[PDB]
């Protein structure tokens, strides 16, 4: 795709999120850079409204899959870069087992040289004393596979995957993710064969930062089709 060309170097990233979970409204801004040749993302996210009212790990999946490293033999399956620069809309529902759900809508597109992810998030049906609002999740590394399928009807893709968040008591909190992506333009995109994105991250802190924030280092690699 011509879009793929926009990702051959290091690209600045800007993320903006407006959230409302159970009436607790918050905003997050993120900045960093992506190097899709290596599937690599380095970002710092800041809560700009004060303290974040949900755990940072619950927002990781929401807070730019156009930065995945696609193997050469799979580059015909990279929907995300093929929709650039006009971009795509990503929507998810995230069901936290035995608790509430997030619904998200993200618009991902270039503004000049910067890849921008503008997100709205709504959470409903949460327990004030459950694992999310009651801050019971661990901050350990999240990894897993995002299973992608083509959606010819919307000229896009669907995806599904589960995140198993470790909880303090030693069990896990499931977050079942359902995803759709639709291009913004009218023209053709790459509609992929079934495959997945193998995604891993590590969370850290900026020692100089006094605001509530998270630093993330992430690698995203497409896989599952053999040469
Ligand atoms: Na690159």
DSSP collapsed to 3 states, the chain: CCHHHHHCCCEEEEEEEEEEECCEEEEEEEEEEEEHHHCEEEEEEEECCCCCCCCHHHHCCCCCHHHCECCHHHHHHCHHHHCCCCCEEEEEEEEECCCCEEEEEEEEEEECCEEEEEEEEEEECCCCCCCCCCCCECCCCCEEEEEEEEEHHHCEEEEEEEEEEEECCCCEEEEEEEEEEEECCCCCCCCCCCEEEEEEEEEECCCCCCCCEEEEEEEEEEECCCC
How far is Cα 45 from Cα 205, in angstroms, rounded to an integer? 10
Residue numbers followed by a gap, the chain, C–N over 2.5 Å: 63
How far is Cα 58 from Cα 132, in angstroms, rounded to an integer? 8
Q: Resolution of the coordinates in A?
A: 1.1
- Rounded distance from Cα 33 to ligand 1 centre (Å): 10
Domains of the chain in sequence order = 1-227 (2.40.155.10)
- Rounded distance from Cα 82 to ligand 1 centre (Å): 15
Contacts of 56 (CB under 8 A, 6+ apart): 45, 139, 203, 214
- Rounded distance from Cα 4 to ligand 1 centre (Å): 10
β-pairing, 114-124 vs 143-151, is unpaired
- Rounded distance from Cα 217 to ligand 1 centre (Å): 15
- Rounded distance from Cα 53 to ligand 1 centre (Å): 34
- Rounded distance from Cα 29 to ligand 1 centre (Å): 23
Q: What's the token pair of residue 96? A: 């936290």
Q: Give the angle subtended at the CA of 193 by the CAs of 188 and 197, to the nearest 5°.
A: 105
- Rounded distance from Cα 223 to ligand 1 centre (Å): 17
How far is Cα 48 from Cα 213, in angstroms, rounded to an integer? 9
Which residues are found with C-beta within 5 Å of the ion, ligand 1? 35-37
How far is Cα 100 from Cα 180, in angstroms, rounded to an integer? 20
């Amino acid at each position: 795709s011509k879009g793929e060309e926009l990702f051959t170097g290091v690209v600045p990233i800007l993320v903006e999120l407006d959230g409302d979970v159970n009436g607790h409204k918050f905003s997050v801004s993120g900045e960093g850079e992506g190097d899709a040749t290596y599937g690599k993302l380095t970002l710092k996210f800041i809560c700009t409204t004060g303290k974040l009212p949900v755990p940072w790990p619950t927002l990781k999946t929401t807070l730019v899959q156009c930065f995945a490293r696609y193997p050469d033999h799979m580059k015909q399956h990279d929907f995300f870069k093929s929709a650039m620069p006009e971009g795509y809309v990503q929507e998810r529902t995230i069901f936290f087992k035995d608790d509430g759900n997030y619904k998200t809508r993200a618009e991902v597109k270039f503004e000049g040289d910067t890849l921008v992810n503008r997100i709205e998030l709504k959470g409903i049906d949460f327990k004030e004393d459950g694992n999310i609002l009651g801050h019971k999740l661990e901050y350990n590394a999240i990894s897993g596979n995002v299973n992608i399928t083509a959606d010819k009807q919307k000229n896009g893709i669907k995806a599904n995957f589960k995140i198993r968040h470790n909880i303090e008591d030693g069990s896990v909190q499931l977050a079942d993710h359902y995803q759709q992506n639709t291009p913004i333009g009218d023209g053709p995109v790459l509609l992929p064969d079934n495959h997945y994105l193998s995604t891993q991250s590590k969370q850290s802190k900026d020692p100089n930062e006094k605001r509530d924030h998270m630093v993330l280092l992430e690698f995203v690699t497409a896989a599952g089709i053999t040469l």
